[PDB]
Amino acid sequence: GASQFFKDNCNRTTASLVEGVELTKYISDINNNTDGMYVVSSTGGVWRISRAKDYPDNVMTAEMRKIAMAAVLSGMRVNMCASPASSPNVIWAIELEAE
Amino acid sequence: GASQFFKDNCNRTTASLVEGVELTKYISDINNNTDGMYVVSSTGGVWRISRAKDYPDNVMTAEMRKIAMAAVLSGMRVNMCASPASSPNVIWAIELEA
Amino acid sequence: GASQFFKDNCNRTTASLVEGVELTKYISDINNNTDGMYVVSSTGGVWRISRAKDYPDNVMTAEMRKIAMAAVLSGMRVNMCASPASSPNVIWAIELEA
Amino acid sequence: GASQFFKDNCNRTTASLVEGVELTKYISDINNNTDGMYVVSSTGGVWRISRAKDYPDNVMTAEMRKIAMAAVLSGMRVNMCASPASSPNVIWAIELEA
Amino acid sequence: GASQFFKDNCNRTTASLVEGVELTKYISDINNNTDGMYVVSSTGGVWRISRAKDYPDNVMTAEMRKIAMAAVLSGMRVNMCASPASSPNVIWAIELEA
Ligand SMILES: CC(=O)N[C@H]1[C@H]([C@H](O)[C@H](O)CO)O[C@@](O[C@@H]2[C@@H](O)[C@H](O)O[C@H](CO)[C@@H]2O)(C(=O)O)C[C@@H]1O
Ligand SMILES: CC(=O)N[C@H]1[C@H]([C@H](O)[C@H](O)CO)O[C@@](O[C@@H]2[C@@H](O)[C@H](O)O[C@H](CO)[C@@H]2O)(C(=O)O)C[C@@H]1O
Ligand SMILES: CC(=O)N[C@H]1[C@H]([C@H](O)[C@H](O)CO)O[C@@](O[C@@H]2[C@@H](O)[C@H](O)O[C@H](CO)[C@@H]2O)(C(=O)O)C[C@@H]1O
Ligand SMILES: CC(=O)N[C@H]1[C@H]([C@H](O)[C@H](O)CO)O[C@@](O)(C(=O)O)C[C@@H]1O
Ligand SMILES: CC(=O)N[C@H]1[C@H]([C@H](O)[C@H](O)CO)O[C@@](O)(C(=O)O)C[C@@H]1O
Ligand code: NA
Ligand code: NA
Ligand code: NA
Ligand code: NA
């Protein structure tokens, strides 16, 4: 399960906690209006990975991408803190877990 | 198979959906006129990977390259949204699947 | 255990040495106030990865992130030099060990 | 063997096609006059990886380096389009094959 | 053993050739005075990887760091061309071997 630190952090926001997600697809799209980076879960849920041009969020968003790839390749689960304001929901934090 | 999301998004465009592709070769070329990044499938199909200098497309295009390498190394399948307007067809979206 | 070199370096500083840590979670967060990169140990300990905007520290911080990911994927242990001035403690140096 | 696409592209040039090469060593050098990135095959052949500072060839040359490392780690073979004009021969295109 | 090419290149310089090294630790440090990237061998030898902000050495130095991590993760041996003018000795060239 999600670390208590990860849960506490997500609980201070308007975003929602999703635990123990198996990501089975990773999408890169440059088409008009659908452009972005996405992940799809084993049950068909879809989330947008945040992007940012400048420091310091350019670092965190790059690491969210690496976490997504690593999850898809390995079958390791993730915990997400995702805003329900938009569709697909935007990932504001993510936790890769080995166990 | 391709996610419904991926399919819906490709369906909005002039590009073609290609599902369950096994990529077996990855090409980097700097020669005049053939310069680019390409992938080749197990049946001999060839696609050009999109490129972009600036943000935000420089992110997506970098991740296309990472998906292509990961598919070649692992034998994981991909789904593509590829324009037939040129040869080789250009990848506008790609989905790596476990 | 930590190399003597790593131990000596950490000893010059106000930071604390932590040896033989198994990292099992890796966190990226962009939320207000909690924004950052973190690692979590197998027993629940939490550390923040250093960030830096400019050269040369942004090189070293990038490699800390790579070490963290590699440790989580592989189960390889790390040794850390971490400052108690903030919570979670900030990683000033890290050593990945085979 | 090399894809027909890869062969056709190399055929347009003054470079030579080399097929089914096992790369066993990967070299980074910053010494005066020998500075560069190189690969060494299982028979002892040496090639220089192309380098470029600007877009778009900075993308392709980075992917050549990624291909070279991936080949060394995995034992996956490569096909090269390499110019005999210099020594070591310079890689103008490379194909990683599963 | 080290390629003839690698040996010849090191033998042009005042540096020392070290062959068949097993790297077991990789270090990233941002602390004053010890800041840098280092590797430690299975026998406790320590070497520093150089840093460079600009092209072209920013490429070669990045690849030295990739070689170091790959060696630590895999147990693949390296050959080094290392100068005794600094302590730890500085890596001027490195060769990863399968
Ligand atoms: C990624 C991120 O910024 N997350 C914020 C979030 C967004 O900025 C906001 O919802 C716009 O999309 O804002 C959060 O709420 C903030 C409050 O904590 C603060 O009192 O007031 C802020 C506006 O001045 C903002 O509403 C949220 O929605 O939970 C915090 C979250 O980290
Ligand atoms: C990657 C990308 O930009 N994809 C676009 C695509 C191309 O921009 C375009 O084909 C030129 O290379 O354009 C798409 O929509 C086109 C419209 O912009 C155009 O006005 O009308 C076209 C119909 O013939 C078409 O609608 C496309 O070709 O599907 C949208 C796509 O995301
Ligand atoms: C990587 C690259 O630029 N490759 C080119 C190559 C080089 O630009 C050139 O050899 C200098 O390194 O040039 C090629 O085209 C050549 C023409 O530039 C030359 O005028 O005539 C040559 C025939 O003797 C040749 O056509 C080449 O050498 O093949 C094309 C290649 O993509
Ligand atoms: C990462 C870093 O810079 N660490 C350095 C710190 C910090 O600059 C200050 O504590 C202010 O945070 O200063 C030292 O004197 C210390 O406290 O040991 C040396 C150390 O190398
Ligand atoms: C692929 C290619 O032609 N690379 C050449 C580059 C590029 O022209 C520039 O770096 C601009 O991208 O210039 C060099 O002096 C270099 O950087 O080593 C020689 C090299 O052959
Ligand atoms: Na909430
Ligand atoms: Na379509
Ligand atoms: Na100390
Ligand atoms: Na030719």
Side-chain angles (χ1 to χ4, degrees), chain A, chain B residues 1-52 54-98, chain C, chain D residues 1-32 34-98, chain E:
Chain A
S3 63
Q4 192 65 50
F5 174 75
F6 190 86
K7 294 186 200 177
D8 290 349
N9 294 339
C10 193
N11 292 153
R12 302 197 204 97
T13 74
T14 59
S16 317
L17 179 70
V18 198
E19 290 185 73
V21 183
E22 188 188 20
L23 300 180
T24 60
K25 310 197 197 283
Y26 183 51
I27 300 168
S28 175
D29 185 331
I30 59 163
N31 277 317
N32 303 160
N33 302 140
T34 60
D35 69 290
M37 301 295 310
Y38 313 88
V39 297
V40 191
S41 73
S42 60
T43 62
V46 186
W47 293 263
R48 183 193 293 274
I49 305 173
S50 294
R51 66 153 90 125
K53 186 173 76 70
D54 301 320
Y55 175 96
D57 283 353
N58 65 353
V59 171
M60 273 71 79
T61 56
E63 299 299 312
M64 296 182 170
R65 297 188 300 272
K66 294 175 193 174
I67 282 166
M69 284 204 86
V72 167
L73 290 179
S74 68
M76 283 184 173
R77 307 295 168 103
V78 303
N79 312 304
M80 292 177 294
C81 182
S83 168
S86 329
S87 292
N89 287 181
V90 181
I91 296 161
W92 286 351
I94 187 165
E95 180 172 67
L96 181 64
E97 61 173 46
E99 57 175 58
Chain B
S3 65
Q4 190 66 51
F5 179 77
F6 190 86
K7 292 193 275 177
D8 293 344
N9 296 338
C10 196
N11 287 350
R12 297 198 212 178
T13 74
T14 59
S16 314
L17 178 68
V18 199
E19 290 186 72
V21 184
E22 188 189 21
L23 299 180
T24 61
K25 309 197 195 283
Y26 183 55
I27 301 168
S28 175
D29 185 331
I30 61 164
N31 278 322
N32 302 339
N33 303 324
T34 60
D35 71 296
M37 303 294 309
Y38 312 89
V39 294
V40 191
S41 71
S42 63
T43 63
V46 186
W47 293 263
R48 183 194 293 275
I49 306 175
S50 292
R51 59 171 169 83
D54 301 321
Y55 177 97
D57 285 348
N58 66 354
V59 172
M60 275 75 78
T61 57
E63 298 300 313
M64 294 183 173
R65 294 188 299 271
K66 295 174 192 174
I67 284 165
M69 170 80 85
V72 170
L73 288 179
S74 70
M76 283 176 90
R77 307 293 168 104
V78 302
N79 313 301
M80 289 178 296
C81 185
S83 171
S86 69
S87 194
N89 291 180
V90 181
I91 296 161
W92 290 345
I94 187 164
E95 181 171 70
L96 181 63
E97 60 173 44
Chain C
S3 66
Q4 190 67 48
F5 177 76
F6 190 85
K7 290 196 275 179
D8 297 343
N9 293 338
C10 193
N11 261 90
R12 295 197 202 182
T13 76
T14 56
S16 316
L17 180 70
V18 196
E19 291 183 73
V21 182
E22 186 187 23
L23 302 180
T24 62
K25 313 196 197 280
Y26 184 51
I27 301 167
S28 175
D29 186 334
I30 60 163
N31 276 322
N32 299 161
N33 303 323
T34 58
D35 183 70
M37 300 297 307
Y38 311 87
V39 295
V40 189
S41 74
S42 59
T43 51
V46 185
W47 292 264
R48 184 196 291 274
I49 303 176
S50 291
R51 63 160 88 156
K53 202 207 207 103
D54 299 324
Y55 178 94
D57 289 347
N58 63 10
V59 172
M60 274 75 79
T61 59
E63 297 300 312
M64 295 183 172
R65 294 187 301 271
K66 293 176 194 174
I67 285 167
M69 170 83 82
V72 168
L73 292 180
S74 69
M76 280 185 173
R77 309 301 203 255
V78 303
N79 311 302
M80 291 175 297
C81 186
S83 168
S86 68
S87 293
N89 285 0
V90 180
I91 299 161
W92 287 348
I94 188 165
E95 178 171 71
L96 178 67
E97 63 173 44
Chain D
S3 66
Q4 189 67 50
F5 177 76
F6 193 86
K7 292 194 276 177
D8 292 347
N9 292 344
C10 195
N11 283 347
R12 300 197 199 188
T13 77
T14 57
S16 315
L17 180 68
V18 198
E19 289 185 76
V21 181
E22 188 188 22
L23 302 180
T24 60
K25 311 196 195 283
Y26 183 55
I27 301 166
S28 175
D29 184 332
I30 60 165
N31 281 135
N32 286 22
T34 60
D35 73 293
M37 300 298 309
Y38 310 88
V39 296
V40 189
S41 70
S42 62
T43 62
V46 183
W47 290 264
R48 181 196 293 278
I49 302 175
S50 292
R51 71 162 187 229
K53 183 173 187 297
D54 306 323
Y55 177 92
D57 284 348
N58 67 351
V59 172
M60 274 74 78
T61 57
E63 299 300 313
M64 295 184 171
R65 292 189 300 271
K66 294 175 196 172
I67 284 165
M69 172 87 71
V72 170
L73 289 180
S74 68
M76 280 184 173
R77 311 309 222 232
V78 303
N79 312 304
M80 291 177 294
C81 184
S83 171
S86 339
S87 199
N89 291 177
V90 180
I91 297 162
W92 288 351
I94 187 163
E95 180 171 67
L96 181 65
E97 61 175 42
Chain E
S3 65
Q4 186 75 52
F5 175 77
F6 190 81
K7 292 187 200 177
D8 294 342
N9 294 342
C10 197
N11 283 332
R12 296 200 181 74
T13 76
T14 58
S16 318
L17 176 70
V18 196
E19 290 181 78
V21 182
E22 189 187 22
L23 300 180
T24 59
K25 310 196 196 283
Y26 182 53
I27 302 167
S28 179
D29 184 329
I30 58 165
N31 280 314
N32 300 155
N33 301 324
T34 59
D35 69 297
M37 302 295 312
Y38 309 89
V39 295
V40 189
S41 72
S42 64
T43 61
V46 183
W47 291 265
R48 182 223 326 164
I49 307 174
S50 38
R51 274 174 319 200
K53 186 166 68 68
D54 301 323
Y55 179 94
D57 282 352
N58 62 357
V59 170
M60 272 75 77
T61 57
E63 300 301 309
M64 292 181 169
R65 295 190 300 269
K66 296 175 194 173
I67 283 167
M69 173 89 69
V72 170
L73 289 179
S74 70
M76 281 184 174
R77 310 254 156 170
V78 301
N79 313 302
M80 292 176 294
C81 182
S83 172
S86 71
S87 195
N89 293 180
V90 61
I91 298 161
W92 287 350
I94 187 164
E95 179 170 69
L96 181 65
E97 48 173 67

